[PDB]
């Protein structure tokens, strides 16, 4: 597979029509998963499934600028399960990242970072076995 945390370079950053695909399997008794689309030290798009925040599962999304987290966007629809294989597709659209899991639409996250072509790395971390991570222009 791939060693986690995993760094996927995004050459020339991202752009609308760019589709990023992350394939792996949630570990048993998972606590968290994170995708971090970074512009240098900033995090343009943080996508963070939490398996046990006050005994609830929640996906937390956010942006980090100059080392400071902004306002969280939270989604209680939670398609992940401990022990099960997943696919995350992040499609960059003009105004938002569009995220589907296992071919079902999950959430959109509006662009806060405007310089899309400088979002040049994806960090993939957490309680997963990572099989593959890649991108394609659609
Ligand atoms: N930024 C925080 O420390 C926040 O703490 C409160 C509790 O006071 C909540 O736990 C909140 O979710 C964050 S935890 C923090 O969240 C960012 C995303 O906003 C990211 O997931 C980071 O890894 C977490 O430490
Ligand atoms: Mg910007």
CSV table of C-alpha atoms and ligand atoms in Angstrom, one decimal:
chain,number,residue,atom,x,y,z
A,1,UNK,CA,0.0,0.0,0.0
A,2,UNK,CA,1.3,3.4,1.0
A,3,UNK,CA,2.9,4.6,4.3
A,4,UNK,CA,0.6,6.9,6.3
A,5,UNK,CA,1.0,9.9,6.8
A,6,UNK,CA,1.4,10.1,3.0
A,7,UNK,CA,2.3,13.2,1.0
A,8,UNK,CA,0.8,13.5,-2.5
A,9,UNK,CA,2.4,16.3,-4.5
A,10,UNK,CA,-0.2,18.2,-6.7
A,11,UNK,CA,2.0,19.7,-9.5
A,12,UNK,CA,1.0,23.3,-10.2
A,13,UNK,CA,-1.6,23.1,-7.4
A,14,UNK,CA,-5.2,22.4,-8.1
A,15,UNK,CA,-7.7,23.7,-10.7
A,16,UNK,CA,-11.4,23.2,-11.5
A,17,UNK,CA,-12.0,19.8,-13.3
A,18,UNK,CA,-9.2,18.2,-11.2
A,19,UNK,CA,-10.4,15.0,-9.5
A,20,UNK,CA,-8.4,13.6,-6.6
A,21,UNK,CA,-9.0,10.0,-5.6
A,22,UNK,CA,-8.0,8.4,-2.3
A,23,UNK,CA,-8.6,4.6,-1.9
A,24,UNK,CA,-8.0,2.7,1.4
A,25,UNK,CA,-9.5,0.8,4.2
A,26,UNK,CA,-10.4,2.1,7.7
A,27,UNK,CA,-8.5,0.4,10.5
A,28,UNK,CA,-10.5,-1.5,13.2
A,29,UNK,CA,-11.6,0.8,16.1
A,30,UNK,CA,-10.6,3.9,14.0
A,31,UNK,CA,-10.4,7.3,15.8
A,32,UNK,CA,-9.8,9.7,12.9
A,33,UNK,CA,-9.0,10.3,9.3
A,34,UNK,CA,-7.6,13.6,7.8
A,35,UNK,CA,-7.0,15.0,4.3
A,36,UNK,CA,-5.0,18.2,4.3
A,37,UNK,CA,-4.9,20.1,1.0
A,38,UNK,CA,-2.0,22.5,1.7
A,39,UNK,CA,-0.7,25.8,0.2
A,40,UNK,CA,2.7,25.7,1.8
A,41,UNK,CA,2.1,25.8,5.6
A,42,UNK,CA,-1.5,26.9,5.2
A,43,UNK,CA,-4.3,24.3,4.9
A,44,UNK,CA,-6.7,25.3,2.2
A,45,UNK,CA,-9.1,22.3,2.8
A,46,UNK,CA,-9.0,20.1,5.9
A,47,UNK,CA,-11.4,17.1,5.7
A,48,UNK,CA,-11.5,15.4,9.1
A,49,UNK,CA,-13.8,12.4,9.9
A,50,UNK,CA,-13.9,12.0,13.7
A,51,UNK,CA,-15.2,8.6,14.9
A,52,UNK,CA,-15.8,9.5,18.5
A,53,UNK,CA,-16.3,13.1,19.5
A,54,UNK,CA,-18.6,12.9,22.5
A,55,UNK,CA,-19.8,9.5,21.3
A,56,UNK,CA,-20.9,10.9,17.9
A,57,UNK,CA,-19.3,10.5,14.4
A,58,UNK,CA,-18.8,13.8,12.6
A,59,UNK,CA,-16.8,15.1,9.6
A,60,UNK,CA,-15.1,18.4,10.4
A,61,UNK,CA,-13.9,20.7,7.6
A,62,UNK,CA,-11.8,23.8,8.0
A,63,UNK,CA,-9.0,26.0,6.7
A,64,UNK,CA,-5.8,27.0,8.4
A,65,UNK,CA,-4.2,30.3,7.6
A,66,UNK,CA,-1.0,31.6,9.3
A,67,UNK,CA,-1.2,28.7,11.8
A,68,UNK,CA,-4.8,29.6,12.9
A,69,UNK,CA,-7.9,27.4,12.3
A,70,UNK,CA,-11.0,29.2,11.0
A,71,UNK,CA,-14.7,28.4,11.4
A,72,UNK,CA,-15.5,24.7,11.3
A,73,UNK,CA,-18.0,23.3,8.8
A,74,UNK,CA,-19.6,20.2,10.2
A,75,UNK,CA,-21.5,17.3,8.5
A,76,UNK,CA,-23.2,14.5,10.5
A,77,UNK,CA,-23.7,12.3,7.4
A,78,UNK,CA,-20.8,9.9,8.1
A,79,UNK,CA,-20.2,7.2,5.4
A,80,UNK,CA,-17.1,5.6,6.9
A,81,UNK,CA,-17.0,2.5,9.0
A,82,UNK,CA,-14.2,0.9,11.0
A,83,UNK,CA,-12.7,-2.0,9.0
A,84,UNK,CA,-14.3,-1.2,5.7
A,85,UNK,CA,-12.8,-0.1,2.3
A,86,UNK,CA,-13.5,3.4,1.1
A,87,UNK,CA,-13.0,5.7,-1.8
A,88,UNK,CA,-12.9,9.5,-1.4
A,89,UNK,CA,-13.2,11.6,-4.6
A,90,UNK,CA,-12.5,15.3,-4.2
A,91,UNK,CA,-13.5,17.2,-7.4
A,92,UNK,CA,-12.3,20.8,-7.6
A,93,UNK,CA,-15.2,22.9,-9.0
A,94,UNK,CA,-15.0,26.7,-9.6
A,95,UNK,CA,-16.4,27.8,-6.2
A,96,UNK,CA,-16.0,24.6,-4.1
A,97,UNK,CA,-14.4,21.3,-3.4
A,98,UNK,CA,-17.1,18.6,-4.0
A,99,UNK,CA,-16.5,15.4,-2.0
A,100,UNK,CA,-18.1,12.1,-2.7
A,101,UNK,CA,-17.4,8.9,-0.7
A,102,UNK,CA,-18.2,5.5,-2.3
A,103,UNK,CA,-19.8,7.2,-5.2
A,104,UNK,CA,-22.3,9.1,-3.0
A,105,UNK,CA,-22.2,12.8,-2.8
A,106,UNK,CA,-21.1,13.9,0.8
A,107,UNK,CA,-20.4,17.6,1.1
A,108,UNK,CA,-19.2,20.7,-0.7
A,109,UNK,CA,-16.7,23.2,0.9
A,110,UNK,CA,-16.5,26.7,-0.6
A,111,UNK,CA,-13.0,27.9,-1.6
A,112,UNK,CA,-11.5,30.1,1.2
A,113,UNK,CA,-8.0,30.0,-0.3
A,114,UNK,CA,-8.2,31.7,-3.7
A,115,UNK,CA,-4.8,30.7,-5.1
A,116,UNK,CA,-5.8,27.2,-6.2
A,117,UNK,CA,-2.7,26.7,-8.3
A,118,UNK,CA,-0.6,27.0,-5.1
A,119,UNK,CA,-2.4,24.2,-3.2
A,120,UNK,CA,0.5,21.9,-4.2
A,121,UNK,CA,0.3,19.0,-1.7
A,122,UNK,CA,-2.2,16.7,-0.2
A,123,UNK,CA,-1.4,15.1,3.2
A,124,UNK,CA,-3.3,11.9,4.0
A,125,UNK,CA,-3.2,10.8,7.6
A,126,UNK,CA,-5.1,8.8,10.2
A,127,UNK,CA,-6.3,5.4,11.1
A,128,UNK,CA,-6.3,3.9,7.6
A,129,UNK,CA,-4.5,1.5,5.4
A,130,UNK,CA,-3.9,3.6,2.3
A,131,UNK,CA,-4.0,1.7,-0.9
A,132,UNK,CA,-3.6,4.5,-3.4
A,133,UNK,CA,-3.9,8.2,-4.0
A,134,UNK,CA,-3.9,10.0,-7.4
A,135,UNK,CA,-5.5,12.7,-9.6
A,136,UNK,CA,-7.0,13.0,-13.1
A,137,UNK,CA,-8.4,15.9,-15.2
A,138,UNK,CA,-12.0,15.3,-16.1
B,1,LIG,N1,-8.7,24.3,17.1
B,1,LIG,C1,-9.1,23.6,18.3
B,1,LIG,O1,-8.3,23.4,19.2
B,1,LIG,C2,-10.6,23.3,18.5
B,1,LIG,O2,-10.8,22.8,19.8
B,1,LIG,C3,-12.2,22.7,20.1
B,1,LIG,C4,-12.3,22.4,21.6
B,1,LIG,O3,-12.0,23.7,22.3
B,1,LIG,C5,-12.8,21.6,19.2
B,1,LIG,O4,-12.1,20.3,19.5
B,1,LIG,C6,-12.5,21.9,17.8
B,1,LIG,O5,-12.9,20.8,16.9
B,1,LIG,C7,-11.0,22.2,17.5
B,1,LIG,S1,-10.0,20.7,17.5
B,1,LIG,C8,-8.9,21.0,16.0
B,1,LIG,O6,-9.8,21.2,14.9
B,1,LIG,C9,-9.1,21.4,13.6
B,1,LIG,C10,-10.1,21.8,12.6
B,1,LIG,O7,-10.9,22.9,13.0
B,1,LIG,C11,-8.2,20.2,13.3
B,1,LIG,O8,-9.1,19.1,13.1
B,1,LIG,C12,-7.2,20.0,14.4
B,1,LIG,O9,-6.4,18.8,14.1
B,1,LIG,C13,-7.9,19.8,15.8
B,1,LIG,O10,-7.0,19.8,16.8
B,2,LIG,MG1,-5.2,32.8,-1.4
